[PDB]
Amino acid sequence: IEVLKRKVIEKVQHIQLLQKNVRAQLVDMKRLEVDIDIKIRSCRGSCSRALAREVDLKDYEDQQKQLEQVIAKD
Amino acid sequence: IEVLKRKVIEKVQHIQLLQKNVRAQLVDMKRLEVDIDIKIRSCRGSCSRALAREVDLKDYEDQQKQLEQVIAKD
Amino acid sequence: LYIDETVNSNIPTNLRVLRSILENLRSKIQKLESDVSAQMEYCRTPCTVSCNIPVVSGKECEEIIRKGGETSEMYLIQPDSSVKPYRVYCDMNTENGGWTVIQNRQDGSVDFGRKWDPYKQGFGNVATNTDGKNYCGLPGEYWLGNDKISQLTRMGPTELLIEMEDWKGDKVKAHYGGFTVQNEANKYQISVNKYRGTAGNALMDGASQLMGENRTMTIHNGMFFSTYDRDNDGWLTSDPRKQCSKEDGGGWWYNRCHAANPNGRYYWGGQYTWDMAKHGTDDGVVWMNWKGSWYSMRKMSMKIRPFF
Amino acid sequence: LYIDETVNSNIPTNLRVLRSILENLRSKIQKLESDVSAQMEYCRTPCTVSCNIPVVSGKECEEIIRKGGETSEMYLIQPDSSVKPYRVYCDMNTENGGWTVIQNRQDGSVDFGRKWDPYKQGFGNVATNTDGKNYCGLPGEYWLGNDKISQLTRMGPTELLIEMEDWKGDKVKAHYGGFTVQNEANKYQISVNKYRGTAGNALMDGASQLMGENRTMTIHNGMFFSTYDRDNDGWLTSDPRKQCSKEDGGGWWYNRCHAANPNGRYYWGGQYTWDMAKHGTDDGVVWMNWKGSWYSMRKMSMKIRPFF
Amino acid sequence: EASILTHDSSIRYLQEIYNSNNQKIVNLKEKVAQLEAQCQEPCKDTVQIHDITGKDCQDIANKGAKQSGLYFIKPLKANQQFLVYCEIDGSGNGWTVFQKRLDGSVDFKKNWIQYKEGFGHLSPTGTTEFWLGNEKIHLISTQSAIPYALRVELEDWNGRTSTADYAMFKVGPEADKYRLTYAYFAGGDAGDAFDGFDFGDDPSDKFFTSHNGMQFSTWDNDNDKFEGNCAEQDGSGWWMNKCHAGHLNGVYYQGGTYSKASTPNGYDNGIIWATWKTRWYSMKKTTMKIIPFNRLTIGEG
Amino acid sequence: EASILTHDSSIRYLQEIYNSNNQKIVNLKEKVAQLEAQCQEPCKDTVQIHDITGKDCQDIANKGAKQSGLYFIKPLKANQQFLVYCEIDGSGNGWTVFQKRLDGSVDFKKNWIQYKEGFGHLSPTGTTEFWLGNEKIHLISTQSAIPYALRVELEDWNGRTSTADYAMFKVGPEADKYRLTYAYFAGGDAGDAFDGFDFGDDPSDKFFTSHNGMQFSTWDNDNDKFEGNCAEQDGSGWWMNKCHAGHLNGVYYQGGTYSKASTPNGYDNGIIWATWKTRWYSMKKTTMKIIPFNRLTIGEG
Amino acid sequence: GPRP
Amino acid sequence: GPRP
Amino acid sequence: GHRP
Amino acid sequence: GHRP
Numbered sequence A, B: 001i002e003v004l005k006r007k008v009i010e011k012v013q014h015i016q017l018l019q020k021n022v023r024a025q026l027v028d029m030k031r032l033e034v035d036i037d038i039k040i041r042s043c044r045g046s047c048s049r050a051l052a053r054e055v056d057l058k059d060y061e062d063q064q065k066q067l068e069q070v071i072a073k074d
Numbered sequence C, D: 001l002y003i004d005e006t007v008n009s010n011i012p013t014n015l016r017v018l019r020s021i022l023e024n025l026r027s028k029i030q031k032l033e034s035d036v037s038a039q040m041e042y043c044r045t046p047c048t049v050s051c052n053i054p055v056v057s058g059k060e061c062e063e064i065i066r067k068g069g070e071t072s073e074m075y076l077i078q079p080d081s082s083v084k085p086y087r088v089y090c091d092m093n094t095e096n097g098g099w100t101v102i103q104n105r106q107d108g109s110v111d112f113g114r115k116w117d118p119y120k121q122g123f124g125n126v127a128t129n130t131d132g133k134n135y136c137g138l139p140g141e142y143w144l145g146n147d148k149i150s151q152l153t154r155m156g157p158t159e160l161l162i163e164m165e166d167w168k169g170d171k172v173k174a175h176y177g178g179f180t181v182q183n184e185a186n187k188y189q190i191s192v193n194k195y196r197g198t199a200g201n202a203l204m205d206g207a208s209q210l211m212g213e214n215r216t217m218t219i220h221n222g223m224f225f226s227t228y229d230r231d232n233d234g235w236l237t238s239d240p241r242k243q244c245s246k247e248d249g250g251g252w253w254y255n256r257c258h259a260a261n262p263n264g265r266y267y268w269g270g271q272y273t274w275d276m277a278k279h280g281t282d283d284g285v286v287w288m289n290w291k292g293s294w295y296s297m298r299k300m301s302m303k304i305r306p307f308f
Numbered sequence E, F: 001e002a003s004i005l006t007h008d009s010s011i012r013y014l015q016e017i018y019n020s021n022n023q024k025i026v027n028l029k030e031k032v033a034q035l036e037a038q039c040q041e042p043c044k045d046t047v048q049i050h051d052i053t054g055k056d057c058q059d060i061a062n063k064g065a066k067q068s069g070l071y072f073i074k075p076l077k078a079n080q081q082f083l084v085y086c087e088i089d090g091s092g093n094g095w096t097v098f099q100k101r102l103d104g105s106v107d108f109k110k111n112w113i114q115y116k117e118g119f120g121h122l123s124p125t126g127t128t129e130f131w132l133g134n135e136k137i138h139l140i141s142t143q144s145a146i147p148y149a150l151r152v153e154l155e156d157w158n159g160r161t162s163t164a165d166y167a168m169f170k171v172g173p174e175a176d177k178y179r180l181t182y183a184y185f186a187g188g189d190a191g192d193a194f195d196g197f198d199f200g201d202d203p204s205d206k207f208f209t210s211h212n213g214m215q216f217s218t219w220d221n222d223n224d225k226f227e228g229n230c231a232e233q234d235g236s237g238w239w240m241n242k243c244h245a246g247h248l249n250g251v252y253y254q255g256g257t258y259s260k261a262s263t264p265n266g267y268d269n270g271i272i273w274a275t276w277k278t279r280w281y282s283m284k285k286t287t288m289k290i291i292p293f294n295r296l297t298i299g300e301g
Numbered sequence G, H: 001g002p003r004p
Numbered sequence I, J: 001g002h003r004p
């Protein structure tokens, strides 16, 4: 049973590991994207020009609810 | 007679000389009185004042006819 | 028993979502490195202005509007014969004009997360050139220093005007008929009174949506000025990360911590949330009593005038 | 015979008449010497005048009336930019005014029996003080000089007006629409024409009570000026005593000798006779065509005007 | 009868007085010739004109003249020289006088030509009334752009005097009639009647009684701002508006004080200066004179 | 099924890119910190003020200043220092400029208080239009009795320039309005328009268009010699008479030439100088500047 | 001399 | 300019 | 901005 | 007068 039901439960743990890790890493990336947006815009009062850019947290939010279902529906 | 009618005649000629002479001096005197009245008056325009005087050729005129009567009635 | 399905059922999907996301984040990363790298190159040259000086001048913007200066633009003022004249933006049109601008936010072109010394001296742009003109009639984002502000307020009775605007175009005010800031040796202590206006009396009363103790720890009146390298806030903590100026992100009269945060972080579009914020807090150009904690204004400004 | 009556009749009477007249002439002579000696004392001091000068001036009295000078009185005139301004009496009332007076008799206050230089430079008083005024409105007796008059007539066609008055107030006039007096090198030679008047034309035709050659030797036109030390008359004699200017008493344009003698001797009361006249001739201020030879005017004047 | 011939002697008596009388006549004619030599000069005139000349009294004063009195002047643009009265001070300032009132002897109701050319008399003692002439005032005050000053000097029936100065004074050409112009009232106790006065009979009084920029007028040449004739009504020659607040060429009232009844039409027409006395006080003395402005008259050097 | 457990490997594959994403974040965060450090300065302003001070530009030049530009000055009777434009030549002459026109960018139709305090802008290069302010011009030119000179410099639309100089230039205090005063025109090819000009309309033109002794006027503070309002009709602030011969604060016209129809009232209201060009020719550039007389400006030393 |  |  |  |  080890190599089986036991091994299955021994992989399941590592999957819940990655679920929480990627939860954390989606939050880090959503925060860095925002930080980078705010910092490029504050170069407009010192430097020759600020890069024109667009930010949508959407792609970030779908991947979150998406992520949450799987974590939930476990 | 020399010492008479001749001496008379000698003197009559001298009276007759005088007569004519004084006839001419009354004319000179009338002329000098008018000339002096005119020259004194002519100082009124240069001098502080001119002597107030009055001329009247009447005393001269009385004397000239008077003398003429004598010269004539000779 | 049969649960061993999940081995070739769930497991393999779990790994399917995770792996996807993981490789999508990778591609965002390098796209960010590529924006930051393009901006580093632009920062090799500076932005320039040519601000020619109006002939008219005086002690502050109210004496200038009295001397005939009726347009809004940069002016030189000499508050005191001991201080050298310096530049300011003069608003000659709101509330009868004669307003000396002390703080301005409108786009997010200047960084406001600075130390004690820059907040002391002043930073940012006072004005930029109007399209094709030899004079600077447009205001930039700035902070006048704290020593200049303190001298302006102690010259006589001074009123403070705070104007704000949201991303749809709505506008409100907070007007304080009495406003003073002590000197550096008293940590720039603020004092305000005689409130009027539509925005909500955040400075003297605290966030009206909180009650009791939660409200009174958000009062700014009577507070000292704090910066991220200088803590004078009203929060007695032992952890060095727990400082209102470090979370909250600006220089301000913080009290455990705020109901108002002008000098906060400029979020494009208005709305933001805890998981967008650097430390999980309501940083952002906030005025709680108007739009709560999670909305950052489009415009925010502070200005003063003698009162009289 | 009995003619020796006149020795005790006629001679004694002649001697009577002659005696009174000779003694009488002797007392008159002494009184006349007292009169000449008193007048010589008076002549140690001069007469004086104060003649304040009218503001208005010009080239002659006709320019001055056209400048508004409407009262008769002394004016300063400058007929020529080369000549220095001089005083003259302007008559602004007779015959439309603007007359420059060149000669004036009215009282016998001035001596007219002068030599050549005095007639050339002028002599006498142009004007005297009106009773209690600070200006000279009354004319005095005078002769402008011969150089001034010749220059005045030589600037342009000029008219001459001669006026007179007798001792009971009747008045007459003689006008000459043309009059010129040449320079000293030409002996002040006179020319006149275009007579009109009530006094009779003594200058161009001579004395109307004479006929033929007697009349023509009394015409004045075409003659030269003579003074008692400068014989330029019309009489060609050898006897030094036979000089119109030595008899007749003035400086004038004599011709064997005259019909008019302005410049003659001023006899008081008008009438005079041969045994009143220094040389037994008609000297005395005469205008033969009006009053004959033995009547001397009360008033006599000469004056000129540019004409136009 | 060769005795009665005593006549020989009596006749020789008569011959002697006849002969002394003749010589006495010759002597008297000598004495008459000696009186004649003393009666040749004319009466001596006390008035005399100085020989120094120049463009105006200040130019004369800079050439050395020290005494006040009569002199000839000749400005650049002038055709002929003309006589003026110069007022000279110890400080070398030479004032050329153009108007004097002091006793009422002269009549100031004159025509356009008499105000142009001048009327009245000049005297070495400054004791006579006159008007110099608008043509002359024009020539002296507009020579080659040299700022000139006017000084008005008043005197009342009590010995009290006051003055009034005007800077950059000018009289215009005959073609501009002889308009009066000045830049500013430069001080003085008499005050500024040229600026006009508010007599109160109406709110427009001050504006209608100012003199700056007014044309000269006389009864036969009206250039006033009035519907009638100011110059013909007030009986003078002056820079009229409707009609005046300062009026030095006015009628001479003895005693100062006068009233509507004394006037011929009911207007004040006397010698008035409204900022110093009422419009019913007429001055005793007046003087208007001019000098280059760099001199005195509240002046520099 | 103990082979499907191949996930054991493929689970350890995601883990790797998790951890390598994580470490790419940390490295990018350090790059953001370096960028923040470079975005802290403000824009660089090209305008600067010199640090040398004094009483006027001539006082600044005598202390060492060599370059033309912006300096603070403070005459003795002034209460606060103020900024000016100084023009400084090789010879050591320091001119303080008080008026500049050059392109029509600044409106000169302004009121009494704006004319008193100053308007327009000051630039280190001298390429801006402005009026320094009557109060300041007054304080500089009436300093303890030290003669000042004025220079007017004009430029037409063809490259030609001209100048006009005036000696002993002064501007009076506010109480007397801000009266212009000068002693004499000192030379220059532009001509003396402050003396007045005979335009030929009327013989009074010259005396109604001279500027010496005139008070300062604006539409709301009329001190002119005119019954109407010169400043309001011509659209400026100036030392008006009736009205002008020189007018440098007038309306700016491109190309110089303009006509009556371009004008709102039918009068010439442009930047004129009648002794140099017709009244219907408006200058391209103007400059009004002052210096102690002992200096240049037809000066001694 | 006003002219009321 | 001038004014009449 | 409060801190419980 | 004349002179015969």
Ligand SMILES: *[C@@H]1O[C@H](CO)[C@@H](O[C@@H]2O[C@H](CO)[C@@H](O)[C@H](O)[C@H]2NC(C)=O)[C@H](O)[C@H]1NC(C)=O
Pocket: D210, D211, D212, D213, D214, J004
């Ligand atoms: C010119 O005048 C004389 C008078 O002076 C006239 O004189 C004849 O003149 C002699 C000389 O004196 C006298 O004796 C005679 O009595 C005169 N005879 C006559 C008949 O008159 C002379 O007639 C006059 N000539 C003319 C032309 O009238």
Ligand SMILES: *[C@@H]1O[C@H](CO)[C@@H](O)[C@H](O)[C@H]1NC(C)=O
Pocket: C211, C212, C213, C214, I004
């Ligand atoms: C303060 O807020 C917290 C949430 O942070 C809540 O649990 C607590 O009840 C509040 N206190 C008061 C007095 O409302």
Ligand SMILES: [Ca+2]
Pocket: C231, C232, C233, C234, C235, C236, C237, C243
């Ligand atoms: Ca703390």
Ligand SMILES: [Ca+2]
Pocket: D231, D232, D233, D234, D235, D236, D237, D242, D243
């Ligand atoms: Ca002879």
Ligand SMILES: [Ca+2]
Pocket: E222, E223, E224, E225, E226, E227, E228, E229, E230
């Ligand atoms: Ca009229």
Ligand SMILES: [Ca+2]
Pocket: F222, F223, F224, F225, F226, F227, F228, F229, F230
């Ligand atoms: Ca006006």
